[PDB]
């Protein structure tokens, strides 16, 4: 996951008009997009 | 006009304005970003192209800055 820094590099090359060698024909950046471990959920708020 | 001679936050890498990035001195964590964008080693050996790319590294504060920026969550 985490593409915002590569997006920042692309936004910087766009100030000079430069293009990547893949020319935006690629898909899915490296590593799984798994959230932070051990998450909680809400209490038994539903009525008896 | 032109930039000031501070040179306090520069990125240590084998880049030169005469040939671009040295592959033997290219950082593997800085390469994470280059590859995510779709950049080839041919673009890294072009003077004018690699001069645009290197600007981003020294701009954030050298290689240790980009090596931390992609490490954020």
Swiss-Prot record, chain A:
Disruption phenotype: Mutants show dramatic reduction in the efficiency of pedestal formation and in the intensity of the residual pedestals that are formed. Sequence repeats lie at residues 18-48. This is Secreted effector protein EspF(U). It is found in: Secreted; Host cytoplasm. The chain holds residues 127 to 173 of 384 of the full protein. The N-terminal 21 amino acids are necessary and sufficient for translocation into the host cell. The C-terminal region, composed of several highly conserved proline-rich repeats, interacts with the SH3 domain of BAIAP2 and BAIAP2L1, and the GTPase binding domain (GBD) of WASL/N-WASP and WAS/WASP. The N-terminal translocation signal and two proline-rich repeats are sufficient for triggering actin polymerization, but each additional repeat gives higher activity. Interacts with host BAIAP2 and host WASL/N-WASP. Can also interact with host proteins BAIAP2L1 and WAS/WASP. Required for efficient pedestal formation in host epithelial cells during infection. Acts as an intermediate between Tir (via host BAIAP2) and host WASL/N-WASP. Directly binds and activates WASL/N-WASP, which stimulates actin polymerization and leads to the formation of actin pedestals at the sites of bacterial adhesion. Belongs to the EspF(U)/TccP family.
Swiss-Prot record, chain B:
The modification Phosphotyrosine is found at residue 54. Residues 5-14 form the CRIB domain. The modification Phosphoserine is found at residue 40. It is found in: Cytoplasm, Cytoskeleton; Nucleus; Cytoplasm. Disulfide bonds: none annotated. Signal peptide: none annotated. It comes from the Eukaryota. Regulates actin polymerization by stimulating the actin-nucleating activity of the Arp2/3 complex. Involved in various processes, such as mitosis and cytokinesis, via its role in the regulation of actin polymerization. Together with CDC42, involved in the extension and maintenance of the formation of thin, actin-rich surface projections called filopodia. In addition to its role in the cytoplasm, also plays a role in the nucleus by regulating gene transcription, probably by promoting nuclear actin polymerization. Binds actin and the Arp2/3 complex. Interacts with CDC42. Interacts with FCHSD1. Interacts with FCHSD2. Binds to SH3 domains of GRB2. Interacts with the C-terminal SH3 domain of DNMBP. Interacts with SNX9. Interacts with the WW domains of PRPF40A/FBP11. Interacts with PTK2/FAK1. Interacts with PACSIN1, PACSIN2 and PACSIN3. Interacts with NOSTRIN. Binds to TNK2. Interacts with SNX33. Interacts with NONO (via second RRM domain); the interaction is direct. Component of a multiprotein complex with NONO and SFPQ; associates with the complex via direct interaction with NONO. This is Actin nucleation-promoting factor WASL. It comes from Homo sapiens (Human). The chain holds residues 207 to 275 of 505 of the full protein.
């Amino acid at each position: 996951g985490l593409p915002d820094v590569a997006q920042r590099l692309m936004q910087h090359l766009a100030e000079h008009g430069i293009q990547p060698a893949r020319n935006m024909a690629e898909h899915i950046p490296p590593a799984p997009n798994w959230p932070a471990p051990t998450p909680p959920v809400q209490n038994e708020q539903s009525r008896p | 006009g032109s930039h000031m001679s501070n040179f306090q936050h520069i990125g240590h890498v084998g880049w030169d304005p005469n040939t671009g990035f040295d592959l033997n001195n290219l950082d593997p964590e800085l390469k994470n970003l280059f590859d995510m964008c779709g950049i080839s080693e041919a673009q890294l050996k072009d003077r004018e192209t690699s001069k645009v790319i290197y600007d981003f590294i020294e701009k954030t504060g050298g290689v240790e800055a980009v090596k931390n920026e992609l490490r954020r969550q």
